[PDB]
Amino acid sequence: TIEVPVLTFVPVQVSAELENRGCWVKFFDKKNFQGDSLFLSGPATLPRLIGPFGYDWENKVRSVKVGPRANLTIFDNHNYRDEDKFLDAGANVANLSKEMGFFDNFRSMVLNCI
Amino acid sequence: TIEVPVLTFVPVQVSAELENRGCWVKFFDKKNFQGDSLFLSGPATLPRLIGPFGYDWENKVRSVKVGPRANLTIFDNHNYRDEDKFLDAGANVANLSKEMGFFDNFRSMVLNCI
């Protein structure tokens, strides 16, 4: 079972444990895993890069880190449409852009656990 | 120990369990607990209502629900400054505004567990 995730603020102890479990992905605001990052634990599926209270994080992700027990597929369009890119377990993408073989602005995704 | 929380997207199973534990608060986009909501599990302290990837949720919260084992204090200014309002365990505030005895735009907060 995989559904749309819930946006939440959790104590560092909780996110650290979800990180230890290994099924996660970190999206960074800057290239080379610099800047702040959004943390997602799976499995989870997002048809749009949004969240409650007006959160809209399209056009923000510049680098990606995938956990040791997760698989990430990003899509070019929303609602899991069109072209896709696959990032395997532990994968690191320092520059998430079309020029580097990905998309300039992916708009939906699916995070699986392995 | 209480620190700044980590913004994360988690599976419904995880947020449901954090909800069951009882130390949480839900911030709704509309009055009377309608619309979408941001979920926070504690303890946690936020000097500013922001998050990674450009998340800025000031001027958004219109109603609040406090968990059965949490206490919430909101401040009028950022960095826990100036006037405060206290919402005890299980509390529900259908209209979070100055006219109703609170603030039009609280800017920082502390979530404690009891």
mmCIF file of all heavy atoms in Angstrom, chain A residues 9 12-13 16-18 23-24 34-35 40 47 50 52 56-57 59 62 80 82 89 93 100 104 108-109:
data_model
loop_
_atom_site.group_PDB
_atom_site.id
_atom_site.type_symbol
_atom_site.label_atom_id
_atom_site.label_comp_id
_atom_site.label_asym_id
_atom_site.label_seq_id
_atom_site.Cartn_x
_atom_site.Cartn_y
_atom_site.Cartn_z
ATOM 1 N N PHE A 9 5.925 18.339 10.838
ATOM 2 C CA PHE A 9 7.150 18.831 11.449
ATOM 3 C C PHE A 9 7.338 17.844 12.594
ATOM 4 O O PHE A 9 6.425 17.659 13.396
ATOM 5 C CB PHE A 9 6.968 20.233 12.025
ATOM 6 C CG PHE A 9 7.394 21.330 11.100
ATOM 7 C CD1 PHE A 9 6.455 22.195 10.552
ATOM 8 C CD2 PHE A 9 8.740 21.517 10.798
ATOM 9 C CE1 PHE A 9 6.851 23.237 9.715
ATOM 10 C CE2 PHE A 9 9.147 22.555 9.962
ATOM 11 C CZ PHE A 9 8.200 23.416 9.421
ATOM 12 N N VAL A 12 13.789 16.135 15.903
ATOM 13 C CA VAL A 12 14.959 15.553 15.260
ATOM 14 C C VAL A 12 15.123 14.073 15.599
ATOM 15 O O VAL A 12 15.640 13.305 14.789
ATOM 16 C CB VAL A 12 16.255 16.307 15.652
ATOM 17 C CG1 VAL A 12 16.214 17.726 15.112
ATOM 18 C CG2 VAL A 12 16.413 16.324 17.161
ATOM 19 N N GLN A 13 14.681 13.671 16.789
ATOM 20 C CA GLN A 13 14.793 12.271 17.201
ATOM 21 C C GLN A 13 13.952 11.377 16.297
ATOM 22 O O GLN A 13 14.346 10.255 15.968
ATOM 23 C CB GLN A 13 14.329 12.085 18.651
ATOM 24 C CG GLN A 13 15.237 12.682 19.719
ATOM 25 C CD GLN A 13 15.264 14.199 19.702
ATOM 26 O OE1 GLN A 13 14.245 14.850 19.462
ATOM 27 N NE2 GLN A 13 16.432 14.771 19.980
ATOM 28 N N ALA A 16 15.437 11.387 12.677
ATOM 29 C CA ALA A 16 16.687 10.630 12.713
ATOM 30 C C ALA A 16 16.391 9.131 12.661
ATOM 31 O O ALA A 16 17.125 8.369 12.034
ATOM 32 C CB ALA A 16 17.472 10.960 13.976
ATOM 33 N N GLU A 17 15.315 8.712 13.326
ATOM 34 C CA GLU A 17 14.936 7.301 13.344
ATOM 35 C C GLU A 17 14.375 6.887 11.986
ATOM 36 O O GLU A 17 14.630 5.777 11.512
ATOM 37 C CB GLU A 17 13.904 7.041 14.449
ATOM 38 C CG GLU A 17 13.443 5.589 14.582
ATOM 39 C CD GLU A 17 14.589 4.615 14.827
ATOM 40 O OE1 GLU A 17 15.663 5.046 15.296
ATOM 41 O OE2 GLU A 17 14.410 3.407 14.562
ATOM 42 N N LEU A 18 13.611 7.773 11.352
ATOM 43 C CA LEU A 18 13.073 7.445 10.039
ATOM 44 C C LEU A 18 14.257 7.348 9.082
ATOM 45 O O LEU A 18 14.251 6.542 8.155
ATOM 46 C CB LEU A 18 12.079 8.517 9.561
ATOM 47 C CG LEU A 18 10.772 8.659 10.356
ATOM 48 C CD1 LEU A 18 9.969 9.833 9.824
ATOM 49 C CD2 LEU A 18 9.955 7.378 10.251
ATOM 50 N N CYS A 23 14.307 4.087 4.395
ATOM 51 C CA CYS A 23 13.453 4.341 3.242
ATOM 52 C C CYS A 23 13.110 5.821 3.201
ATOM 53 O O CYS A 23 12.070 6.245 3.711
ATOM 54 C CB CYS A 23 12.166 3.517 3.305
ATOM 55 S SG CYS A 23 11.207 3.682 1.766
ATOM 56 N N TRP A 24 13.992 6.607 2.593
ATOM 57 C CA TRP A 24 13.785 8.046 2.523
ATOM 58 C C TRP A 24 14.490 8.698 1.347
ATOM 59 O O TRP A 24 15.266 8.064 0.632
ATOM 60 C CB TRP A 24 14.292 8.710 3.811
ATOM 61 C CG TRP A 24 15.731 8.368 4.147
ATOM 62 C CD1 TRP A 24 16.164 7.389 4.998
ATOM 63 C CD2 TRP A 24 16.915 8.979 3.609
ATOM 64 N NE1 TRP A 24 17.539 7.355 5.024
ATOM 65 C CE2 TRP A 24 18.025 8.319 4.181
ATOM 66 C CE3 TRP A 24 17.144 10.020 2.697
ATOM 67 C CZ2 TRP A 24 19.348 8.666 3.872
ATOM 68 C CZ3 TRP A 24 18.463 10.365 2.389
ATOM 69 C CH2 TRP A 24 19.546 9.688 2.977
ATOM 70 N N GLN A 34 23.650 21.083 -0.773
ATOM 71 C CA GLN A 34 23.834 22.227 0.106
ATOM 72 C C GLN A 34 22.486 22.901 0.332
ATOM 73 O O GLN A 34 21.502 22.571 -0.329
ATOM 74 C CB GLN A 34 24.819 23.223 -0.510
ATOM 75 C CG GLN A 34 26.231 22.678 -0.664
ATOM 76 C CD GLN A 34 26.720 21.986 0.596
ATOM 77 O OE1 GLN A 34 26.686 20.758 0.700
ATOM 78 N NE2 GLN A 34 27.163 22.775 1.566
ATOM 79 N N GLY A 35 22.444 23.843 1.267
ATOM 80 C CA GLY A 35 21.202 24.538 1.553
ATOM 81 C C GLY A 35 20.281 23.685 2.402
ATOM 82 O O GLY A 35 20.687 22.630 2.886
ATOM 83 N N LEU A 40 11.591 13.159 3.138
ATOM 84 C CA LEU A 40 10.418 12.333 2.886
ATOM 85 C C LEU A 40 10.738 10.884 3.217
ATOM 86 O O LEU A 40 11.766 10.358 2.793
ATOM 87 C CB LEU A 40 9.972 12.427 1.422
ATOM 88 C CG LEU A 40 9.611 13.811 0.876
ATOM 89 C CD1 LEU A 40 10.875 14.507 0.394
ATOM 90 C CD2 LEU A 40 8.618 13.671 -0.275
ATOM 91 N N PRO A 47 1.381 13.218 -6.479
ATOM 92 C CA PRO A 47 0.941 13.610 -7.822
ATOM 93 C C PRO A 47 1.280 15.066 -8.146
ATOM 94 O O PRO A 47 1.256 15.477 -9.307
ATOM 95 C CB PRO A 47 -0.563 13.356 -7.774
ATOM 96 C CG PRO A 47 -0.896 13.685 -6.351
ATOM 97 C CD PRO A 47 0.224 13.004 -5.590
ATOM 98 N N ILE A 50 3.254 19.733 -3.723
ATOM 99 C CA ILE A 50 2.611 20.744 -2.897
ATOM 100 C C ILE A 50 2.385 20.229 -1.482
ATOM 101 O O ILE A 50 2.677 19.073 -1.175
ATOM 102 C CB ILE A 50 1.247 21.157 -3.490
ATOM 103 C CG1 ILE A 50 0.305 19.949 -3.516
ATOM 104 C CG2 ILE A 50 1.436 21.694 -4.903
ATOM 105 C CD1 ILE A 50 -1.095 20.270 -4.005
ATOM 106 N N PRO A 52 0.107 21.390 2.580
ATOM 107 C CA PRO A 52 -0.854 22.286 3.228
ATOM 108 C C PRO A 52 -0.294 23.678 3.514
ATOM 109 O O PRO A 52 0.921 23.890 3.513
ATOM 110 C CB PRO A 52 -1.229 21.530 4.504
ATOM 111 C CG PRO A 52 0.014 20.737 4.811
ATOM 112 C CD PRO A 52 0.422 20.234 3.437
ATOM 113 N N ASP A 56 4.247 25.063 -2.012
ATOM 114 C CA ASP A 56 4.396 24.726 -3.422
ATOM 115 C C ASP A 56 5.900 24.635 -3.622
ATOM 116 O O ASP A 56 6.588 25.659 -3.645
ATOM 117 C CB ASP A 56 3.823 25.822 -4.322
ATOM 118 C CG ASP A 56 3.955 25.490 -5.800
ATOM 119 O OD1 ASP A 56 5.054 25.071 -6.219
ATOM 120 O OD2 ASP A 56 2.966 25.653 -6.544
ATOM 121 N N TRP A 57 6.416 23.418 -3.740
ATOM 122 C CA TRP A 57 7.848 23.256 -3.906
ATOM 123 C C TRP A 57 8.325 22.790 -5.275
ATOM 124 O O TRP A 57 9.311 22.060 -5.385
ATOM 125 C CB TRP A 57 8.428 22.365 -2.799
ATOM 126 C CG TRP A 57 7.652 21.121 -2.491
ATOM 127 C CD1 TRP A 57 6.451 21.039 -1.842
ATOM 128 C CD2 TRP A 57 8.042 19.775 -2.784
ATOM 129 N NE1 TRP A 57 6.072 19.722 -1.709
ATOM 130 C CE2 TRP A 57 7.031 18.925 -2.278
ATOM 131 C CE3 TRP A 57 9.151 19.201 -3.423
ATOM 132 C CZ2 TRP A 57 7.094 17.534 -2.392
ATOM 133 C CZ3 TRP A 57 9.214 17.816 -3.536
ATOM 134 C CH2 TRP A 57 8.189 16.998 -3.021
ATOM 135 N N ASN A 59 10.015 23.767 -8.858
ATOM 136 C CA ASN A 59 11.078 24.732 -9.147
ATOM 137 C C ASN A 59 12.011 25.035 -7.974
ATOM 138 O O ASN A 59 12.601 26.119 -7.909
ATOM 139 C CB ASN A 59 10.464 26.045 -9.655
ATOM 140 C CG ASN A 59 9.800 25.892 -11.013
ATOM 141 O OD1 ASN A 59 10.457 25.566 -11.997
ATOM 142 N ND2 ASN A 59 8.491 26.122 -11.068
ATOM 143 N N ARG A 62 17.263 21.135 -6.347
ATOM 144 C CA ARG A 62 18.453 21.205 -7.191
ATOM 145 C C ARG A 62 19.384 19.995 -7.035
ATOM 146 O O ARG A 62 20.230 19.752 -7.892
ATOM 147 C CB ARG A 62 19.212 22.504 -6.904
ATOM 148 C CG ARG A 62 18.461 23.765 -7.330
ATOM 149 C CD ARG A 62 18.700 24.097 -8.806
ATOM 150 N NE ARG A 62 18.170 23.095 -9.731
ATOM 151 C CZ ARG A 62 16.896 23.022 -10.114
ATOM 152 N NH1 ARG A 62 16.006 23.894 -9.651
ATOM 153 N NH2 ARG A 62 16.514 22.086 -10.979
ATOM 154 N N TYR A 80 2.015 11.806 -12.292
ATOM 155 C CA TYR A 80 2.841 10.708 -12.796
ATOM 156 C C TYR A 80 2.800 10.573 -14.306
ATOM 157 O O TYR A 80 2.757 9.460 -14.835
ATOM 158 C CB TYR A 80 2.385 9.396 -12.158
ATOM 159 C CG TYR A 80 1.955 9.560 -10.721
ATOM 160 C CD1 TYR A 80 0.616 9.433 -10.356
ATOM 161 C CD2 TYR A 80 2.882 9.886 -9.731
ATOM 162 C CE1 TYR A 80 0.210 9.628 -9.035
ATOM 163 C CE2 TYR A 80 2.485 10.084 -8.409
ATOM 164 C CZ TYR A 80 1.151 9.954 -8.069
ATOM 165 O OH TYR A 80 0.759 10.153 -6.761
ATOM 166 N N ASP A 82 4.126 11.406 -18.416
ATOM 167 C CA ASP A 82 5.238 11.567 -19.339
ATOM 168 C C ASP A 82 6.582 10.949 -18.948
ATOM 169 O O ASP A 82 6.625 9.861 -18.373
ATOM 170 C CB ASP A 82 5.381 13.053 -19.686
ATOM 171 C CG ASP A 82 4.084 13.642 -20.238
ATOM 172 O OD1 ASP A 82 3.333 12.901 -20.911
ATOM 173 O OD2 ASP A 82 3.815 14.839 -20.010
ATOM 174 N N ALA A 89 18.719 2.916 -4.824
ATOM 175 C CA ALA A 89 19.097 3.029 -3.416
ATOM 176 C C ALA A 89 20.451 3.695 -3.206
ATOM 177 O O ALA A 89 21.429 3.368 -3.881
ATOM 178 C CB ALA A 89 19.095 1.648 -2.762
ATOM 179 N N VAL A 93 22.336 12.699 -6.632
ATOM 180 C CA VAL A 93 22.336 13.474 -7.868
ATOM 181 C C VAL A 93 22.673 14.902 -7.453
ATOM 182 O O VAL A 93 21.844 15.607 -6.876
ATOM 183 C CB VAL A 93 20.963 13.415 -8.572
ATOM 184 C CG1 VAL A 93 20.964 14.322 -9.801
ATOM 185 C CG2 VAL A 93 20.671 11.986 -8.992
ATOM 186 N N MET A 100 21.830 17.720 -17.163
ATOM 187 C CA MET A 100 22.557 16.629 -16.534
ATOM 188 C C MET A 100 21.881 15.275 -16.719
ATOM 189 O O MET A 100 22.284 14.287 -16.111
ATOM 190 C CB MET A 100 22.756 16.921 -15.045
ATOM 191 C CG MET A 100 23.610 18.152 -14.776
ATOM 192 S SD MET A 100 25.220 18.072 -15.608
ATOM 193 C CE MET A 100 26.111 17.004 -14.496
ATOM 194 N N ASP A 104 14.330 19.690 -15.611
ATOM 195 C CA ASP A 104 14.558 21.009 -15.034
ATOM 196 C C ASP A 104 13.589 21.233 -13.883
ATOM 197 O O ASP A 104 13.906 21.928 -12.910
ATOM 198 C CB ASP A 104 14.373 22.087 -16.101
ATOM 199 C CG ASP A 104 15.570 22.197 -17.022
ATOM 200 O OD1 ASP A 104 16.669 21.767 -16.613
ATOM 201 O OD2 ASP A 104 15.415 22.719 -18.146
ATOM 202 N N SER A 108 6.055 15.294 -10.198
ATOM 203 C CA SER A 108 5.374 14.263 -9.422
ATOM 204 C C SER A 108 6.387 13.167 -9.141
ATOM 205 O O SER A 108 7.442 13.119 -9.775
ATOM 206 C CB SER A 108 4.150 13.706 -10.166
ATOM 207 O OG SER A 108 4.483 13.174 -11.434
ATOM 208 N N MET A 109 6.084 12.284 -8.197
ATOM 209 C CA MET A 109 7.048 11.245 -7.865
ATOM 210 C C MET A 109 6.458 10.084 -7.090
ATOM 211 O O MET A 109 5.343 10.157 -6.574
ATOM 212 C CB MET A 109 8.157 11.854 -7.011
ATOM 213 C CG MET A 109 7.590 12.529 -5.761
ATOM 214 S SD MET A 109 8.775 12.929 -4.465
ATOM 215 C CE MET A 109 8.910 11.343 -3.647
#
